[PDB]
Design a binder for this molecule. Structure first.
Ligand SMILES: Cc1ccncc1NC(=O)Cc1cc(Cl)cc(O[C@H]2CC(=O)N2)c1
Ligand SMILES: Cc1ccncc1NC(=O)Cc1cc(Cl)cc(O[C@H]2CC(=O)N2)c1
Ligand SMILES: [Cl-]
Lengths: 305, 300
């Protein structure tokens, strides 16, 4: 019993974190095999950030301009190249702690664990979701750039996020490990704002199933709804549309609890139109949308890594 | 910016998790140096769980009755002893992954990270607080016993909790790493109930300071309060009394934000009276009490 916002065990990722310094800027790097990945903005001064020409800034750098520190050992940089918004520093040593890994680009609503780092040292781990507006509501300070997001699928770490910046609203933006930004953001010190966010409907339903599994049923009702009527209500409340794929994905949770997906949608519609009436669900007075259906199944069944 | 429930990176603890089997029972163990720590109830059968006599059950076991598996390697048990409710299995190999560590017994309101495990394998990491009623609101299933709670301030892991059982309300009870239970609980399947839980007042104040540090001030007011008047009000909402120790602990956060502790207490009194009126504080519609003053300073 119990339901917590749970991150993946971070050990496999901790063994990959290094410190990258270029001039006065120090941030985090991810060392996998003989390459260290980090935000390309490590090469910028404050003035360069206003309007950087990264190819021009990079051509002026030599290998010895990048200091990479893994623990208390300095790694030798023997090459450097840029892929989109990520800098790749070739090092003379393959990371002996390199886990089985892959780089995956996730979709909005998908969750992942973030290993927040400063100076190449992991400080904390938290679970979060890629918002529909492509930001993450992370917890990051200056020096956290290069911190990564990941999932574990069996014994393989799938790296999906690298931290680059904080927007004026306090939310965060970054890229996949191929350097492609999530969202309409650019790596430049310039006026940028996140689009209006929406709630991840399939995740709220997953969390309502988790609440039922944990003995919280007050919100259930005798009603059902069509997918189209539910989507009309979802649009009204700034909830993401629910597709048939979402319903299919909620199939196992629906079969385990005996609450059809459209039956749970009728509970969600009533919750949206009426509120919770002073009550809570899993210790929350708001509808939680940062647990996917897979996260709920994983936590309620004790899957290990 | 941002404020999350943040756990410590679990790597240092993952390298210590092992599987311990005694007969038909399998649970988790914590392998540090040449000793594996685990709940002593691993030696119980179904028939032993209401009134086990652990000294009697343990005297009947030989070293080879305990199977310890670290990854895909079986560790040889060369000794065994019981310390309170923890069993200590001496093994023939020191854990090469043993981090710098210590055992610390925590007080209610203290937070820690839990590395939930099954069959010696880590499943997930989350953040917990030791409730005022000495239980923890964890996420644990059958097989999670022996999973541990810890803090890693600097590079030293301070182990503070070892999971032993789930009470009928769904909350969890366990011991420190010296085997002493937190709370009035016993490792027996006899009827046990947690005392009425209360909100950790000092932690709610810490989190209100975190909200101010992160730019939110809507809940502030022009009022102050005496410590005694605050406690008289707060107790009516099942909040823990705020002591002068707590007021002192909030000193740095008070000095950083410019809001006196009793001034923040008046905000809390008003929030308890009015609720949030459709507003949120750090993305929450309820008052959060699982961040300590130390956690707020570390994260913000
Ligand atoms: C200080 C901090 C805190 C947390 N996480 C990260 C950081 N660091 C930064 O944001 C530094 C930075 C890097 C880039 Cl590529 C762009 C940038 O300005 C953009 C952000 C916006 O809206 N204009 C600023
Ligand atoms: C099933 C489960 C789920 C999560 N975490 C742990 C578990 N396992 C247990 O609770 C097993 C267990 C061990 C002990 Cl030492 C005592 C016990 O019964 C006490 C609890 C109560 O009210 N009487 C029960
Ligand atoms: Cl609501």
């Amino acid at each position: 019993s119990g339901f917590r916002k749970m991150a993946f065990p971070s050990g496999k990722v901790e063994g990959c974190m290094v410190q990258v310094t270029c001039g006065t800027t120090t941030l985090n790097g991810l060392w996998l095999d003989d390459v260290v990945y980090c935000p390309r903005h490590v090469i910028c001064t404050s003035e360069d950030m206003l309007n950087p020409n990264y190819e021009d800034l990079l051509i002026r750098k030599s290998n010895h301009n990048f200091l990479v520190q893994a623990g208390n050992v300095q790694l030798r940089v023997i090459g450097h190249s840029m892929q989109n918004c990520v800098l790749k520093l070739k090092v003379d040593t393959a990371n002996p702690k390199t886990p089985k890994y892959k780089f995956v680009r996730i979709q909005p609503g998908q969750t992942f664990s973030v290993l927040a780092c400063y100076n190449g040292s992991p400080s904390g781990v938290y679970q979060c979701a890629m918002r529909p507006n492509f930001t993450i509501k992370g917890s990051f300070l200056n020096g956290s750039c290069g911190s990564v997001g990941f999932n574990i699928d069996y014994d393989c770490v799938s790296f999906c996020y690298m931290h680059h910046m904080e927007l004026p609203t306090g939310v965060h933006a970054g890229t996949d490990l191929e350097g492609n930004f999530y969202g309409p953001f650019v790596d430049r010190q310039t006026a940028q704002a996140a689009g209006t966010d929406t709630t991840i409907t399939v995740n709220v339903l997953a969390w309502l199933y988790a609440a039922v599994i944990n003995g919280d049923r007050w919100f259930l009702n005798r009603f059902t709804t069509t997918l189209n009527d539910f989507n009309l209500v979802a649009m009204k409340y700034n909830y993401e549309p629910l597709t048939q794929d979402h319903v299919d994905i909620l199939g196992p949770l629906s079969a385990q609890t005996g609450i059809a997906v459209l039956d749970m949608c009728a509970s969600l519609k009533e919750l949206l139109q009426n509120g919770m009436n002073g009550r809570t669900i899993l210790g929350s007075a708001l509808l939680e949308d940062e647990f996917t259906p897979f996260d709920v199944v994983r936590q309620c069944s004790g899957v290990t890594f």
